[PDB]
Amino acid sequence: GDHRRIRGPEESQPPQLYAADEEEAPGTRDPTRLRPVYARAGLLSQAKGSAYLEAGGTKVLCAVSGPRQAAALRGRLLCDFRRAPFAGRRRRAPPGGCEERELALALQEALEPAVRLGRYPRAQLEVSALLLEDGGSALAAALTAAALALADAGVEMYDLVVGCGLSLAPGPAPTWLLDPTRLEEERAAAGLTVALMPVLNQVAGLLGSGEGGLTESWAEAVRLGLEGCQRLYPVLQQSLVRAARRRGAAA
Amino acid sequence: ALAARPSAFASTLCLRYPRTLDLYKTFLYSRQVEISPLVAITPFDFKSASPDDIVKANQKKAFTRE
Amino acid sequence: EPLEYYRRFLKENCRPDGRELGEFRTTTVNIGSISTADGSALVKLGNTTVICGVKAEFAAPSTDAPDKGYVVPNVDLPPLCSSRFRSGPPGEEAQVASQFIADVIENSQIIQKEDLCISPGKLVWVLYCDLICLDYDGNILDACTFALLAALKNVQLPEVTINEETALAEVNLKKKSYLNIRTHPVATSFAVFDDTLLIVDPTGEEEHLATGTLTIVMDEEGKLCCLHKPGGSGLTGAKLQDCMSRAVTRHKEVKKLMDEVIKSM
Amino acid sequence: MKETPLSNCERRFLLRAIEEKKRLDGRQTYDYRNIRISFGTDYGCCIVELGKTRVLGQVSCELVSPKLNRATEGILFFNLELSQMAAPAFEPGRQSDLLVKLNRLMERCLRNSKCIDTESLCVVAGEKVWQIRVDLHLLNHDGNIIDAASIAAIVALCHFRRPDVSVQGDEVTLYTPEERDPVPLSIHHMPICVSFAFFQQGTYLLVDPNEREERVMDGLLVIAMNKHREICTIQSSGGIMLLKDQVLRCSKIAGVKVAEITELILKALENDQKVRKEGGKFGFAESIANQRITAFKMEKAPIDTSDVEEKAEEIIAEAEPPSEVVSTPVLWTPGTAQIGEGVENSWGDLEDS
Amino acid sequence: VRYCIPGERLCNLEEGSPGSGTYTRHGYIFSSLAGCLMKSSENGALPVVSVVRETESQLLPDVGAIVTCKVSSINSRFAKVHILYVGSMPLKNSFRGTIRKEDVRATEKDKVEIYKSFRPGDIVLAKVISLGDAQSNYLLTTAENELGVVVAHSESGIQMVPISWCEMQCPKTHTKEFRKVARV
Amino acid sequence: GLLTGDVQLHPEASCLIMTTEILRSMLYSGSDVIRDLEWVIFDEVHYINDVERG
Amino acid sequence: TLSEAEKVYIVHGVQEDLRVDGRGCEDYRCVEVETDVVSNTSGSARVKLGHTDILVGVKAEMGTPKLEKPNEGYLEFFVDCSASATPEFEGRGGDDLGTEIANTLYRIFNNKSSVDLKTLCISPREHCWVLYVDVLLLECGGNLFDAISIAVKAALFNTRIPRVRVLEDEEGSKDIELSDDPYDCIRLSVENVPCIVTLCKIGYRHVVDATLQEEACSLASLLVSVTSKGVVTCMRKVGKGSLDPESIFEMMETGKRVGKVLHASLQSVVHKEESLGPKRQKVGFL
Amino acid sequence: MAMEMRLPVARKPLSERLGRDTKKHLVVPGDTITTDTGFMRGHGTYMGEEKLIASVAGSVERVNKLICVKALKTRYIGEVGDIVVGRITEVQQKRWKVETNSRLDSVLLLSSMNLPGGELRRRSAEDELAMRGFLQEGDLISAEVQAVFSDGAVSLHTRSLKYGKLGQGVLVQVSPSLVKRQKTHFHDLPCGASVILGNNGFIWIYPTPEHKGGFIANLEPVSLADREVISRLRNCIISLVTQRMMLYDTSILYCYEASLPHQIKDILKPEIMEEIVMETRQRLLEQEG
Amino acid sequence: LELLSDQGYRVDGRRAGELRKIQARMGVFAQADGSAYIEQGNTKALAVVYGPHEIRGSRARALPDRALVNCQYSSATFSTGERKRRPHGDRKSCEMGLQLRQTFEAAILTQLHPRSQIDIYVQVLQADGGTYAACVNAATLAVLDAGIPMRDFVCACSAGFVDGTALADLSHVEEAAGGPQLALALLPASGQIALLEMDARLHEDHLERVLEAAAQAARDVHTLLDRVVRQHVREASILLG
Known part of the structure; x- marks a missing residue:
């Protein structure tokens, strides 16, 4: 198979497809709540900038490398999304996946409207994000963490990027929910993730697909996503303050 | 919008790694292991000609070209 | 400047880390945090953080001996742990860091593949243990080994029973068994300076300036599994006998650590 | 790195020669550089030397399940390879427009001629059948890689000997050279490649050219044709523009040459079988010229293994025992424990808040 | 003292002026870094407010800047270098440069043989002049009395010493060699 | 520089001394030398009356 | 690329409801859609929106149902990017664009009510129909998303799916037996297949069907997926600049109206092409 | 706004809408152009064996010793x-x-x-x-x-x-x-x-x-x-x-x-x-x- | 299965020395610098060329004496009965683009564009029979459409051998029968051969007749494509003026 890795069995069917325990029932909740979030910046020592974001069942680690050699008059912004194989219900092929490339492009087309590349001619910035565990909305964590890492790496930006996520209930009276989990995401019909700049009040990225076809529900999904991105800001406000207070006092 | 308290995995991931007598004995350094220079003037204090400056002031002052 | 500056601390007998040239960094581990994997463990060694995860699946036994369940290790070095690794196919350092772990798993005989078969010739367990380095500061092959051994002490598998007329597999997810572990191989790494100086627990800068490296892994009965010497200056029997005397204490330290963390449940 | 360039004096001299119908190494137009074969010890392994080129051939078989459809035959891999040591230019992934034409020539010749009998390589159908796998390597490049590669593949396939099995009822069994004697293969014919080079727009031709003569030529014509009088592939290539009498002349020439080469190959295989059957000594070792300055041989030697016990004993006895400062493990909360110099506080809390 | 995030309201255009690493919009002054709040009062009131981290891990070169370098190889008409320090501070990575045979001396003169000016392995102080092409990227210059090789190295691994404006001599074997000595 | 017909020396020098026909030769084409010209002086103007070269 | 003065002229023109071609802020250039162009496949289309050129093909083949649901089929997309479109598309280089389009099409069609899934299953847990949609980029002249989302609805409307009456009984001939009729097929009920609507933003005005020059002067854009009934399937924002909340709401209405007109006029044109059958011949590439 | 979506129409060949006959000399690659005693080759042609052979489609244009072929599609x-x-x-x-x-x-x-x-x-x-x-x-x-x-x-x-x-x-x-x-x-x-x-x-x-240069x-x-x-x-x-x-x-x-x-x-x-x-x-x- | 009846008729109804029907076209695309379209029998080809331009990448890979011919080959995933999708790494595409580069490095009179590239692209929309000759003829037409000078009008055709007779313009049914197939690339004025290929076994006595029949079938393709070129040039000459 692969001549650069250790070869095992050619085929391997996971026991979930043989799992005789029937799918359980998620439950119910209040759709006006947010999972408590703990954020830490400046984690890695060998990285120019890093941040670790954890909320409920989500664990994502992002690191930012400094400018390197090689629209110039402007610098590029390379991105790379990759999730740990021991994440989710099943295993994943190490070489890659189309979903990862889709999330990488959804990251690149969302973090460029924030940094000002007109200050790094002929240079480039590289951002790497890793998902240790998938326990809910993922693209709402690869944006917050990769934006905290950039601000902590001493690059000049217009503002931060704060993300959120939503999902649609499958009942006869569907209602959008805030911060869904895997028990509330695999039983859903549609999902939406927004990227709002809290001060400039400008939407950076939008993505959504599903079974909701009336152009009056998506207005609410968008504006409650904006309210979520306006409610996640203070925690990220005190995280970079603590990061700089600790980093500066070490000199 | 309440921020929360960490848990084991995070509080171990964020670790800062920063004479008191003698231990681990065999691993000390003592147990495991003329110059007449006649040096020249030590620096060259540039007290002298520095040609670029020469040719510039030379031609500017001279200003004859004949 | 490079060589002379460090030897000032060497003659001082206190390297810039603040160590007595014969002591290890601070070591800490956690087990049982990632709930989407069969077993996982996080190892911190004063930087050089490594995390491992185990997933169990079903697979067909091999054609030669249809009573063995495969175990496949893999070590990955992402471009975020350090700044010298570039994206793409795995590099030389990760390939050697994976072949070393495969050799340790094979030679040490920590597990027996005959304990993983369900029905001979039809189905066997397969274990996927993946290690990802979160930060590269030095001494990679010591923490990778400790991460793998710590992870293998927590993986638990469910009781699977195969019918006769249906001939399918019914997993009993309530009664979950454990894994049988025979030995506890622990590794120790030495960095040799220009021709005579040997230090323990090196650092990336020291490995950048050193001229060799040696690694020795020991069992719980004073038996050597592998003697990894990629090459360099050259050593003698007396120096190796000096190294194993330190490795005995290191192995006793680590085995007491594992014997204590597991007891706390 | 790249290969040395070609001057403008050698080109003139080679073309003056070719005009004059005299070659560098003395051999006239319709000649080959003489050949020299050498056999390994385990079956299906040979080293052919055409002039100063070397190719290593090695056959090997294995038992697999035969895909879906074609339930009563076997598969036949091939893999040419160019070794970085063959010549300066060869680079593992920077000569990707010669490998293709070479693999193709080799595969079309060997697999479309239907000389190997892949009919009788089954055990059951729908179940395990033998999967052979030829392998060639180029060791030293001196021109005409494909004639040598073809002769090498021929000899390697005509010297192999399979394992062998017992099948009766619905039950298998696999023997070994002591339980049962290895078995030969079935080879219908002997397809042998020939190459021609054309010089200054088809006015002259030269059989079997070497590497300088290969850099002063317009294009190449290959004609692969098994014994008797039966052509099996042709592939014009290079920079050539051909007539119609010339293809026929070339076909005649290739006929003659393949006749002679098959003579040689048969004689060499016969001699090798005679040697293996008499009971004498064979192998790569007993092929090294002894009449030559660059060869040396040494029979066995007990060195003196009389002292190792004493030295090891004194070494173990003469060194410092493990010390006795034992460390303590600290318990924070079930799940995480620390060993080493430790940390002052139990854990951080409200450090900055 | 207070720190910053790369956006917040700081001052009006009348209550101060933007400084280094800041931007303004709609009559307000907005932060663009996470450093420290510094207000340079200077003289004349209306302080030029700016934010500086003051812990520079990396910094991009400019049109004019002093850099400490390290020669990699030399040619008859150029000399590739590696940027190592941006003025004083250490650099986490290494860029590339090129000194053409016009930037050695402060006259842009003829002659000026490159071979005996910048022997490889030395450390030099130079100034950039441009952002360069894709072949030569930074186009450094040493056309000054203060620029040139500062700390050389002997043939056999001995710290070297300046001896003149053009000549340096070994202390051990008393050997004479040619460099381009910069003023200390 | 001397741009005489039979002697050509330093055609890129700061000061060029040439016959008259050379000036018209470099004036028919661009030659990118007129851009950096500050003074052009004629030494024998009495050839306006010349019957074949005026 | 185009200079700064040209970009200034274009952005000024768009704000004045004038464009270099002469149309308005909402006009839409005509297309030359056609069907039944390729022989070996089971449905074809050819959409020409301008300098762009599209050619697709749908082939229905026998297959096995997936594990999650047994009474269903599935759809397979493969957006090839031929190298004849642009010299820079030589060999490798058209892979990222092709993957981006294929993933967008998957998100468009990843719903329970896209067309149907009961019709493509014949025997539960044992067999199902599979559809291979194969887009082939021939030329690129801007607005590539809509020129493909139209040729997909067009080609999907022209499928055959030859009927099979084979009995599944073990005693009977379980092996799939066709109807043996070379001209016996079944339609596909594609009435509510969605389509993409692109809205480039220049200045503070949004423009439908932007050209390459008008695309190079824009900073962002929005994609809306609307069926004939007027419902939204996918909504993805693509670009390099912010957009602002208001422009989402005022772009959604234009996406709705353009979608409704596009679907009604496409239903009319396909019915006009179908009203007369084997007459009128078929012309394409010659 | 109606979004016209028309249908392709077959092209009428031979340019019959006006009707003209050319009096020029037309050639295709491989054709042998006039091979008289002495002639000079232009752009668009080449020489073989005592032959002026056209190498591009177009019409021959001669000014008093010169045979050349003017193609109808080229670059500047x-x-x-x-x-x-x-x-x-x-x-x-x-x-x-x-x-x-x-x-x-x-x-x-x-x-x-x-x-x-x-x-x-x-x-x-x-x-x-x-x-x-x-x-x-x-x-x-x-x-x-x-x-x-x-x-x-x-x-x-x-x-x-x-x-x-x-x-x-x-x-x-x-x-x-x-x-x-x-x-x-x-x-x-x-x-x-x-x-x-x-x-x-x-x-x-x-x-x-x-x-009344950038x-x-x-x-x-x-x-x-x-x-x-x-x-x-x-x-x-x-x-x-x-x-x-x-x-x-x-x-x-x-x-x-x-x-x-x-x-x-x-x-x-x-x-x-x-x-x-x-x-x-x-x-x-x-x-x- | 009968591939040649006693009466002499093939499976599809044509005699031994009879070709299929060809229907070509010049100037299909507008953005590119050349185009063509040919359907030889039931095989649909397509070719697009780009004129001499600046070398892409500028990695010092130029030739100071001539131009750089670069030919590709591709195939649609619906070009045959089964899907048979392939990645862009196959060695069939590489060998077809190498025989295309070999024949067009010999047909084109390339010593007039130093330090320049010529990019040739071929797309096969439906493959049934000889693909090589359909690609060669479509790219010969595209090169003529682009105005690139060349020595002659290269045209290609195949042949075969069944029951002691020589066929011409074989089809997929006849090709997939294990016979001595054979293809050329001919320059009609000189009779020279630009490429020769072969597979499967064949006696030495019958090579002259298969080769002669293939050359004659290529000369028969020449007239049919020549009338298309002459009608196109007379069309544009009438349009111009």
């Missing part, structure tokens, strides 16, 4: 004193690189450029730092070819007052064989706009410069009555260029007047071009004839 070939229009694609240390639909790139030397200031002050290496600042990547110029290099390359200069960096307007690229050779390629058409007929196939349309930016809004003229000329140029028409001052003026009766937005149909090109054809027939 440079000649001395030829007006061209190009775009900067690379900015080098001592030159720019300009793309002008040729077999290679064209070089604009720094020595030949009206630098800012437009008079005699100085020219030295201090300008070299800022030379790469104003003539940046992707700008438009309009220069004149200076000389022919030894590998088909062309060097172009900007040593005049009408040449230099261009401003606002629209660009239309066509094949470099529909432009008629003349002596004045600069025009000031009495419609409300101007035009530059680049000999390489680049047509540049810009408004008249009000009263020194002036003039990045201010252009009046509404000027855009409609530019759009009309853009569509008329596309219409004449499409079928056969060779472009020059009178054909564009004739077609512009013929396009007044109906709107600028509605002229994109296959038939409206025909009914305009034929009317211009007959106006040329009743004027020249």
Whole structure:
């Protein structure tokens, strides 16, 4: 198979497809709540900038490398999304996946409207994000963490990027929910993730697909996503303050 | 919008790694292991000609070209 | 400047880390945090953080001996742990860091593949243990080994029973068994300076300036599994006998650590 | 790195020669550089030397399940390879427009001629059948890689000997050279490649050219044709523009040459079988010229293994025992424990808040 | 003292002026870094407010800047270098440069043989002049009395010493060699 | 520089001394030398009356 | 690329409801859609929106149902990017664009009510129909998303799916037996297949069907997926600049109206092409 | 708004709509051209064995010893004193690189450029730092070819007052064989706009410069009555260029007047071009004839 | 299965020395610098060329004496009965683009464009029979459409051998029968051969007749494509003036 890795069995069917325990029932909740979030910046020592974001069942680690050699008059912004194989219900092929490339492009087309590349001619910035565990909305964590890492790496930006996520209930009276989990995401019909700049009040990225076809529900999904991105800001406000207070006092 | 308290995995991931007598004995350094220079003037204090400056002031002052 | 500056601390007998040239960094581990994997463990060694995860699946036994369940290790070095690794196919350092772990798993005989078969010739367990380095500061092959051994002490598998007329597999997810572990191989790494100086627990800068490296892994009965010497200056029997005397204490330290963390449940 | 360039004096001299119908190494137009074969010890392994080129051939078989459809035959891999040591230019992934034409020539010749009998390589159908796998390597490049590669593949396939099995009822069994004697293969014919080079727009031709003569030529014509009088592939290539009498002349020439080469190959295989059957000594070792300055041989030697016990004993006895400062493990909360110099506080809390 | 995030309201255009690493919009002054709040009062009131981290891990070169370098190889008409320090501070990575045979001396003169000016392995102080092409990227210059090789190295691994404006001599074997000595 | 017909020396020098026909030769084409010209002086103007070269 | 003065002229023109071609802020250039162009496949289309050129093909083949649901089929997309479109598309280089389009099409069609899934299953847990949609980029002249989302609805409307009456009984001939009729097929009920609507933003005005020059002067854009009934399937924002909340709401209405007109006029044109059958011949590439 | 979606219509071959027979000599590659005692080969042909063999499709054109074949589709070939229009694609240390639909790139030397200031002050290496600042990547110029290099390359200069960096307007690229050779390629058409007929196939349309080199930016809004003229000329140029028409001052003026009766937005149909090109054809027939 | 009846008729109804019907076209695309379209029998080909331009990448890979011919080959995933999708790494595409580069490095009179590239692209929309000759003829037409000078009008055709007779313009049914197939690339004026290929076994006595029949079938393709070129040039000459 692969001549650069250790070869095992050619085929391997996971026991979930043989799992005789029937799918359980998620439950119910209040759709006006947010999972408590703990954020830490400046984690890695060998990285120019890093941040670790954890909320409920989500664990994502992002690191930012400094400018390197090689629209110039402007610098590029390379991105790379990759999730740990021991994440989710099943295993994943190490070489890659189309979903990862889709999330990488959804990251690149969302973090460029924030940094000002007109200050790094002929240079480039590289951002790497890793998902240790998938326990809910993922693209709402690869944006917050990769934006905290950039601000902590001493690059000049217009503002931060704060993300959120939503999902649609499958009942006869569907209602959008805030911060869904895997028990509330695999039983859903549609999902939406927004990227709002809290001060400039400008939407950076939008993505959504599903079974909701009336152009009056998506207005609410968008504006409650904006309210979520306006409610996640203070925690990220005190995280970079603590990061700089600790980093500066070490000199 | 309440921020929360960490848990084991995070509080171990964020670790800062920063004479008191003698231990681990065999691993000390003592147990495991003329110059007449006649040096020249030590620096060259540039007290002298520095040609670029020469040719510039030379031609500017001279200003004859004949 | 490079060589002379460090030897000032060497003659001082206190390297810039603040160590007595014969002591290890601070070591800490956690087990049982990632709930989407069969077993996982996080190892911190004063930087050089490594995390491992185990997933169990079903697979067909091999054609030669249809009573063995495969175990496949893999070590990955992402471009975020350090700044010298570039994206793409795995590099030389990760390939050697994976072949070393495969050799340790094979030679040490920590597990027996005959304990993983369900029905001979039809189905066997397969274990996927993946290690990802979160930060590269030095001494990679010591923490990778400790991460793998710590992870293998927590993986638990469910009781699977195969019918006769249906001939399918019914997993009993309530009664979950454990894994049988025979030995506890622990590794120790030495960095040799220009021709005579040997230090323990090196650092990336020291490995950048050193001229060799040696690694020795020991069992719980004073038996050597592998003697990894990629090459360099050259050593003698007396120096190796000096190294194993330190490795005995290191192995006793680590085995007491594992014997204590597991007891706390 | 790249290969040395070609001057403008050698080109003139080679073309003056070719005009004059005299070659560098003395051999006239319709000649080959003489050949020299050498056999390994385990079956299906040979080293052919055409002039100063070397190719290593090695056959090997294995038992697999035969895909879906074609339930009563076997598969036949091939893999040419160019070794970085063959010549300066060869680079593992920077000569990707010669490998293709070479693999193709080799595969079309060997697999479309239907000389190997892949009919009788089954055990059951729908179940395990033998999967052979030829392998060639180029060791030293001196021109005409494909004639040598073809002769090498021929000899390697005509010297192999399979394992062998017992099948009766619905039950298998696999023997070994002591339980049962290895078995030969079935080879219908002997397809042998020939190459021609054309010089200054088809006015002259030269059989079997070497590497300088290969850099002063317009294009190449290959004609692969098994014994008797039966052509099996042709592939014009290079920079050539051909007539119609010339293809026929070339076909005649290739006929003659393949006749002679098959003579040689048969004689060499016969001699090798005679040697293996008499009971004498064979192998790569007993092929090294002894009449030559660059060869040396040494029979066995007990060195003196009389002292190792004493030295090891004194070494173990003469060194410092493990010390006795034992460390303590600290318990924070079930799940995480620390060993080493430790940390002052139990854990951080409200450090900055 | 207070720190910053790369956006917040700081001052009006009348209550101060933007400084280094800041931007303004709609009559307000907005932060663009996470450093420290510094207000340079200077003289004349209306302080030029700016934010500086003051812990520079990396910094991009400019049109004019002093850099400490390290020669990699030399040619008859150029000399590739590696940027190592941006003025004083250490650099986490290494860029590339090129000194053409016009930037050695402060006259842009003829002659000026490159071979005996910048022997490889030395450390030099130079100034950039441009952002360069894709072949030569930074186009450094040493056309000054203060620029040139500062700390050389002997043939056999001995710290070297300046001896003149053009000549340096070994202390051990008393050997004479040619460099381009910069003023200390 | 001397741009005489039979002697050509330093055609890129700061000061060029040439016959008259050379000036018209470099004036028919661009030659990118007129851009950096500050003074052009004629030494024998009495050839306006010349019957074949005026 | 185009200079700064040209970009200034274009952005000024768009704000004045004038464009270099002469149309308005909402006009839409005509297309030359056609069907039944390729022989070996089971449905074809050819959409020409301008300098762009599209050619697709749908082939229905026998297959096995997936594990999650047994009474269903599935759809397979493969957006090839031929190298004849642009010299820079030589060999490798058209892979990222092709993957981006294929993933967008998957998100468009990843719903329970896209067309149907009961019709493509014949025997539960044992067999199902599979559809291979194969887009082939021939030329690129801007607005590539809509020129493909139209040729997909067009080609999907022209499928055959030859009927099979084979009995599944073990005693009977379980092996799939066709109807043996070379001209016996079944339609596909594609009435509510969605389509993409692109809205480039220049200045503070949004423009439908932007050209390459008008695309190079824009900073962002929005994609809306609307069926004939007027419902939204996918909504993805693509670009390099912010957009602002208001422009989402005022772009959604234009996406709705353009979608409704596009679907009604496409239903009319396909019915006009179908009203007369084997007459009128078929012309394409010659 | 109705979103017309028409259907393809079969093309009528042989150009039967007017009907003409050619009296020229037509050849295809491989054909043997006249093989008399002594002749000289042109561009488009080659020689074999005592034979003049055509190497490209076209018509033979001979001026009194010379057999050559003129192809009907080529790329631009440079000649001395030829007006061209190009775009900067690379900015080098001592030159720019300009793309002008040729077999290679064209070089604009720094020595030949009206630098800012437009008079005699100085020219030295201090300008070299800022030379790469104003003539940046992707700008438009309009220069004149200076000389022919030894590998088909062309060097172009900007040593005049009408040449230099261009401003606002629209660009239309066509094949470099529909432009008629003349002596004045600069025009000031009495419609409300101007035009530059680049000999390489680049047509540049810009408004008249009000009263009276890139020194002036003039990045201010252009009046509404000027855009409609530019759009009309853009569509008329596309219409004449499409079928056969060779472009020059009178054909564009004739077609512009013929396009007044109906709107600028509605002229994109296959038939409206025909009914305009034929009317211009007959106006040329009743004027020249 | 009968591949040649006693009466002499093939499976599809044509005799031994009879070709299929060809229907070509010049000037299909507008953005590119050349185009063509040919359907030889039931095989639909397509070719697009780009004129001499600046070398992409500019990695000092130029030739100071001539131009750089670069030919590709591709195939649609619906070109045959089964889907048979392939990645862009197959060695069939590489060998077809190498025989295409070999024949067009010999047909084109390339010593007139130093330090220049010529990019040739071929797309097969439906493959049934000889693909090589359909690609060669479509790219010969595209090169003529682009105005690139060349020595002659290269045309290609195949042949075969069944029951002691020589066939011409074999089809997929006849090709997939294990016979001595054979293809050329001929220059009609000189009779020279630009490429020769073969597979499967064949006696030495019958090579002259298969080769002669293939050359004659290529000369028969020449006239049919020549009338298309002459009608196109007379069309444009009438249009121009």
